Scaffold this motif. Structure first.
Motif, PDB file in Angstrom:
ATOM      1  N   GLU B  85     -12.058  68.737  23.720  1.00 34.39           N
ATOM      2  CA  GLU B  85     -12.277  68.938  23.347  1.00 34.39           C
ATOM      3  C   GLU B  85     -11.059  69.935  22.497  1.00 34.39           C
ATOM      4  O   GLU B  85     -11.398  71.102  21.339  1.00 34.39           O
ATOM      5  N   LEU B  86      -9.835  69.006  22.623  1.00 32.35           N
ATOM      6  CA  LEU B  86      -8.711  69.806  21.902  1.00 32.35           C
ATOM      7  C   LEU B  86      -9.104  70.579  20.118  1.00 32.35           C
ATOM      8  O   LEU B  86      -9.505  71.970  19.664  1.00 32.35           O
ATOM      9  N   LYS B  87      -8.686  70.214  19.399  1.00 36.85           N
ATOM     10  CA  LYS B  87      -8.894  70.080  18.196  1.00 36.85           C
ATOM     11  C   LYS B  87      -9.818  70.433  17.623  1.00 36.85           C
ATOM     12  O   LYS B  87     -11.083  69.700  18.356  1.00 36.85           O
ATOM     13  N   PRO B  88     -10.630  71.047  16.733  1.00 32.98           N
ATOM     14  CA  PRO B  88     -11.740  70.971  15.759  1.00 32.98           C
ATOM     15  C   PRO B  88     -13.131  69.579  15.894  1.00 32.98           C
ATOM     16  O   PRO B  88     -13.089  69.385  14.751  1.00 32.98           O
ATOM     17  N   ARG B  90     -12.153  66.971  17.589  1.00 39.82           N
ATOM     18  CA  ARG B  90     -11.154  65.491  17.525  1.00 39.82           C
ATOM     19  C   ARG B  90     -11.651  64.982  19.156  1.00 39.82           C
ATOM     20  O   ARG B  90     -11.201  64.172  20.135  1.00 39.82           O
ATOM     21  N   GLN B  93     -10.358  65.810  24.464  1.00 38.87           N
ATOM     22  CA  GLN B  93      -9.319  66.023  24.043  1.00 38.87           C
ATOM     23  C   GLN B  93      -8.322  66.122  25.881  1.00 38.87           C
ATOM     24  O   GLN B  93      -7.199  66.992  25.675  1.00 38.87           O
ATOM     25  N   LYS B 110     -11.006  83.353  18.619  1.00 40.43           N
ATOM     26  CA  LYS B 110     -11.391  82.082  17.502  1.00 40.43           C
ATOM     27  C   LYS B 110      -9.808  81.064  18.701  1.00 40.43           C
ATOM     28  O   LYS B 110      -9.401  80.141  17.879  1.00 40.43           O
ATOM     29  N   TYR B 111      -9.724  81.732  20.373  1.00 41.21           N
ATOM     30  CA  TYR B 111      -9.188  80.961  21.332  1.00 41.21           C
ATOM     31  C   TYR B 111      -9.231  81.046  22.499  1.00 41.21           C
ATOM     32  O   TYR B 111      -9.698  82.085  22.993  1.00 41.21           O
ATOM     33  N   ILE B 124      -7.393  76.629  23.470  1.00 40.96           N
ATOM     34  CA  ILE B 124      -7.485  75.763  22.544  1.00 40.96           C
ATOM     35  C   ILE B 124      -7.815  77.120  20.930  1.00 40.96           C
ATOM     36  O   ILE B 124      -6.814  77.357  20.461  1.00 40.96           O
ATOM     37  N   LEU B 125      -8.958  76.647  20.238  1.00 37.50           N
ATOM     38  CA  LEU B 125      -9.694  77.528  19.524  1.00 37.50           C
ATOM     39  C   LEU B 125     -11.081  77.275  19.429  1.00 37.50           C
ATOM     40  O   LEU B 125     -11.803  78.157  20.728  1.00 37.50           O
ATOM     41  N   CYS B 128     -14.703  74.222  18.602  1.00 36.57           N
ATOM     42  CA  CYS B 128     -13.434  73.548  19.282  1.00 36.57           C
ATOM     43  C   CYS B 128     -14.962  73.285  21.461  1.00 36.57           C
ATOM     44  O   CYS B 128     -15.472  74.214  21.180  1.00 36.57           O
TER      45      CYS B 128
END
Lengths: 46, 173
Positions: B85-88, B90, B93, B110-111, B124-125, B128
């Motif tokens: 799950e790359l971006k929020p 997406r 990922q 947040k990473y 990542i973030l 995610c």
RNA sequence: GAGCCGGUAGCGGGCGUGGAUCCCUGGAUGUCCGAAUGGGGGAACCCGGCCGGCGGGAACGCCGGUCACCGCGCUUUUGCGCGGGGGGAACCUGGGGAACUGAAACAUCUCAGUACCCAGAGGAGAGGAAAGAGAAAUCGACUCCCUGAGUAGCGGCGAGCG
RNA sequence: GUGGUUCGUGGAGCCAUGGGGGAAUCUGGGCGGACCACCGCCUAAGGCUAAGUACUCCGGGUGACCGAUAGCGCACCAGU
RNA sequence: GCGAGCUAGCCCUGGCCAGGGUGAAGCUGGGGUGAGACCCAGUGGAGGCCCGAACCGGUGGGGGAUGCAAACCCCUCGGAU
RNA sequence: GCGAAUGCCGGCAUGAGUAACGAUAAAGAGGGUGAGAAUCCCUCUCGCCGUAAGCCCAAGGGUUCCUACGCAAUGGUCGUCAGCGUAGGGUUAGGCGGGACCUAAGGUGAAGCCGAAAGGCGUAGCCGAAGGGCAGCCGGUUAAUAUUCCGGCCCUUCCCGCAGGUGCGAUGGGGGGACGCUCUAGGCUAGGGGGACCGGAGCCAUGGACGAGCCCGGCCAGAAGCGCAGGGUGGGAGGUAGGCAAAUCCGCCUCCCAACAAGCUCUGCGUGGUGGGGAAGCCCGUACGGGUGACAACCCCCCGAAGCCAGGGAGCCAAGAAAAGCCUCUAAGCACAACCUGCGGGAACCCGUACCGCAAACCGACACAGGUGGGCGGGUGCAAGAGCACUCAGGCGCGCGGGAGAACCCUCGCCAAGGAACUCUGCAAGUUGGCCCCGUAACUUCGGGAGAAGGGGUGCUCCCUGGGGUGAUGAGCCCCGGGGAGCCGCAGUGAACAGGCUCUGGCGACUGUUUACCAAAAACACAGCUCUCUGCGAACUCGUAAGAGGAGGUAUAGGGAGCGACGCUUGCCCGGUGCCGGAAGGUCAAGGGGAGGGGUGCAAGCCCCGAACCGAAGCCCCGGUGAACGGCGGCCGUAACUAUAACGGUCCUAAGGUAGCGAAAUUCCUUGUCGGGUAAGUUCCGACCUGCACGAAAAGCGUAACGACCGGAGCGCUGUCUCGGCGAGGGACCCGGUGAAAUUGAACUGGCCGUGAAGAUGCGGCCUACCCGUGGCAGGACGAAAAGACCCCGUGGAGCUUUACUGCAGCCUGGUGUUGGCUCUUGGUCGCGGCGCGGCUGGGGGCCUAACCCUCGGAUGGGGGGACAGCGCUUGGCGGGCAGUUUGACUGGGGCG
């Protein structure tokens, strides 16, 4: 022997046909070209 | 049979039951129909394991129960995953039948950290996601295309090659 | 002003000085295509709402008329009523825009802002009362013809352009 | 940074603009070719405007213009 | 400006390969060991697999050279799920 | 003002009454018509098809189709014949096909998105087919049509009425139509075969037989009612944290009936009842024969599908398209009038048909032995089979006929005795060719090389015996041995279709694919390896900006690549080059930023030049880099009674060839030297190896199998050859009909030896020399073809190449812009080594964030990045990816020199 002539109503027609020429810039062009210019008839007319 | 389907959960509280072994021909992924509570289904990822007799899901909550998947946030450290799950949101990922997924090898604010399955590493973030479990691809490797050319049978380009040609033809070519 | 049913001269039949043939101008029809435009489409074909007679409906029910594309104003209300668009030999301005060939090569240059393509106005557009020109405190719209002048001048100061 | 101008980078301006800064309302504000003083001109950054020149599909006129391999190629069930 | 009713491709959608031959995975049974490996026998029927028609081709020779023809006729040959 | 430009246009002669009749599947005879018939009509012998030279559906072409008249030209001769002329006439459908239904590609395309303009893309919806779907069949009937016209039999949709029925009522939902390939069970028509078992029309001639004898046939279609035959799904309740946006549908969990149960869509009987029915056939053409009347017959067993039931079953992987119908229902109206049904009446269109159609009517400009998609394609015989020989139905004899049989080319047949020596070469041809039995070597990745190699079998007669389909099984049919006895010819797959084998080597693994009209190969392709750019909104490819591709892919992946199974093994050098990293230092653009000078200025001012320093990539400089480009030494001495060498001496280079191989297709001195093969062998094959110039990655040595690849050898066999010599069919020759063609100034055109511009029929001297022709044979007419491709020359052209010239595309790059806030900081500077301050201004680090973009994930809100960046403007740079030019002269040939 397969020349290159085998006509195809469907084909030839389609491909070439009043319309088309029309639809087109080009086509249109010459066409009304031919028209006056020459007289005659035209493709599809064929 | 020339088609796609699922790839990214985001409706939870849902009951995850391991549909079945529909090993699949179209992305190196081998997935089985995942039976949800309502009855709505999905040829889901192929993250190896989770026996026929389905029996899983995910959730904003938790449940590392192999396979399954939640946000980065909701995930252990030293863990192997996929459903990249790359971006929020997406959805996926990365890791496609790419068995060796990623391993939250350390996260930060947040990473969250990820071992780049492919062959590198970074972060990542927040929310995610990404579901642990393996892949499924039985080393989807190897196997002989003997006295013929599987290729062709490819349906998968003989887009054949060349390089030596007689000419001076195609891009950087 | 007295002959005619076109080029057909031929058969068979016929209108006519109580102004025929034909010459004019203004008419009503103008089938189907084509910008097409009601809808579809390999043009000249095949398909739909409203009105319509009511029509053979012998004791059984249809073509005709119609209508309506889309971009333009805007009396906006639920938008009703005006313009366009497609042409068109040549000519017109804008939009875009080239090598040959000359320079006895060829990169500058030339052919040129030409040839072509595009858009669009017209019967003509182009342009058009000056933050202009030049310098005698002189001139005054724009345009076009002659002249200025192949001059002042531009330039691998070369071919040329001018 | 290009244009047009006779100007091909030039001592090279005017007008027109591709990017960036971004003034004044009559002692205002461009101009007369780098610029500067003084003189002289003009007043922009909206618009309409017949006539004088250009072109022959059309109709006419005229020919030190032709005569069927010349003239438009095609003088008549030819751009067929 | 003009063209894939030339040809090289690529997308979509149908049709087509007369007969025959070879006999791998498997599954059935039997086989000395713990189970087995693994052996054998049966069944079995794959493979851009073999022998060959139509069909696809067009090396190797023959004719033809103002031909039947601006590539064809003859014998021959390769491919033949 | 014209011979004259291989000139243009037109006519007209040439060769020439020779060359051709478009496949060597042949004909010949009698009558008939006609002005006139090898070439037309009838008839009788004969040849060719027969998987076609069959009918059929398409596509293409469009009256070519029929009928009555006619032959001027087209018919490569005729011609009364025509697919030629004129005239008339011919093809009709609620159920066949196209539309009045559906969508994938694709094309369009209101909205939306980007272009200088023209334009690009493109949702939904629409266009779009032998893919989906849909309601019939058999006989008759004209000069032509026909599933349309006749008639007999079978149906469908809409509408009005009434009768009975039930929440009907969208298309929004759900199933749903829906599918790969290879293989195979169960059942049944198509189709075929035997019947002397039934019907009937003449037979037998001949020696024989009137007999299960010869010859025809003994079928086609159908309401449902109905048993062989399968073919498709299960049945209730409830929960529906609730989906498939909205509830009853289906999806998902729980408890009961969860069968060979019951369920609804094709074949047989059949059979209603109809038709056909050949052999007739009295009126009638007793003949362009048949139009139309006996009666017919109307049955059994046999074989049996490569797609009939059916959306089968079994296996497998590369894992097989979307909208009508059926049920759920909102809007909504019916809910005594909405939909389902029943009966009765009423309605049903638009355009397509002739004939050709492995073709003179279709493409090849022509009646051209060229190509063109689907359907069983009749039988007898081969092990089988659309292969083969003969023939069924139907088709046709090629549209030029006679006549001689010389050379000579064609196609084909034969030989003794030898039997490749012919020759570049067994190129050709000839051997060999089919099934069964016996039998099978080196080598192997154990699959194969084996059909290897090598034999032997096959015919028709009678005998006793064993098997599987035959409803038990008892005229029926099939696979089959068996073994015994026996008969004939030179032969017994008798004809016809049918490997010559072996021994060796080289390359490429292999099936392949490709240069259409020369070349199918050692060329590409590959399955397989290795470096490798890329984290997504990828990287590269098209694109002017959108955008598509990529890929609904996501590092077991996507692109770039040099080799190209497998085995064994890939070493040495980063001085230059490309690249990756570094960025402290030099450099340097635009630019900031001030000393200072300059012009005019009465003066405030008003324009420039401006430089110290700060300042980008790039380049310079440090390193890493080889399945990245690329390269990988020289000579003198020494045990070597003779030769590098074991060692040693060195100069230069970045190291200075390693393992394997070697006169290989890299070795010209060379047919190198030795060996084998032979009567000799400059090809081979082995070995040496001084490798003129192999070598590991454009791999290196080898490698089973594999090849229309190339080269080497042996048996086998044949006129390939020792000369051949005979023959068969086809032109050539004589006849009749028709009747071209490039080249050519013109011409009645001899040899000689000499000559000329130096290879003369035509000029000189001489010697032979009557005029014309036909069947020939090639030498000369510098014969024909074509203003040489080989050459040089034009400061001609066009394509590819790199450190050629320049420039653009793209890419990297400083400052600048709609690119807003908050804070942490060090540097310069001038002023008042310094520190305190001060304006100035430079560097930089941070969440944020209001642009921007992207994001989405079910709405416009959230989310993520964010001052980015996209993207605009100037800077600079790389930059053969591309675009345009250029790259002299001399030259006792161009070049090199």
């Amino acid at each position: 022997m397969k020349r290159t002539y085998q006509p195809n109503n469907r084909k030839r027609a389609k491909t070439h046909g009043f319309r088309a020429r029309m639809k087109t810039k080009s086509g249109r062009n010459i066409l009304a070209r031919r028209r006056a210019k020459g007289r005659h008839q035209l493709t599809v007319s064929d | 049979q020339y088609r796609i389907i699922d790839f990214k959960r985001d409706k939870d509280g849902i009951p995850g039951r391991v549909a079945t072994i529909e090993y699949d021909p179209n992305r190196s992924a081998n997935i089985a129909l995942i039976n949800y509570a309502d009855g709505e289904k999905r040829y889901i990822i192929a993250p190896k394991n989770l026996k026929v007799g389905m029996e899983i899901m995910s959730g904003p909550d938790a449940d590392i129960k192999i396979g399954n998947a939640l946000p980065l946030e909701n995930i252990p450290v030293g863990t192997l995953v996929h459903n990249i799950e790359l971006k929020p949101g997406r959805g996926g990922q990365l890791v496609r039948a790419a068995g060796t997924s990623a391993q939250v090898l350390g996260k930060e604010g947040k990473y969250v950290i990820v071992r780049l399955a492919s062959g590198e590493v970074r972060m990542i973030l927040g929310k995610c996601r990404a579901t642990v479990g393996e892949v499924g691809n039985g080393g989807r490797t190897d196997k002989p295309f003997v006295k013929a050319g599987n290729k062709h049978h490819k349906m998968k380009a003989p887009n054949v090659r060349g390089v030596a040609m007689n000419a001076v033809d195609h891009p950087f070519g």
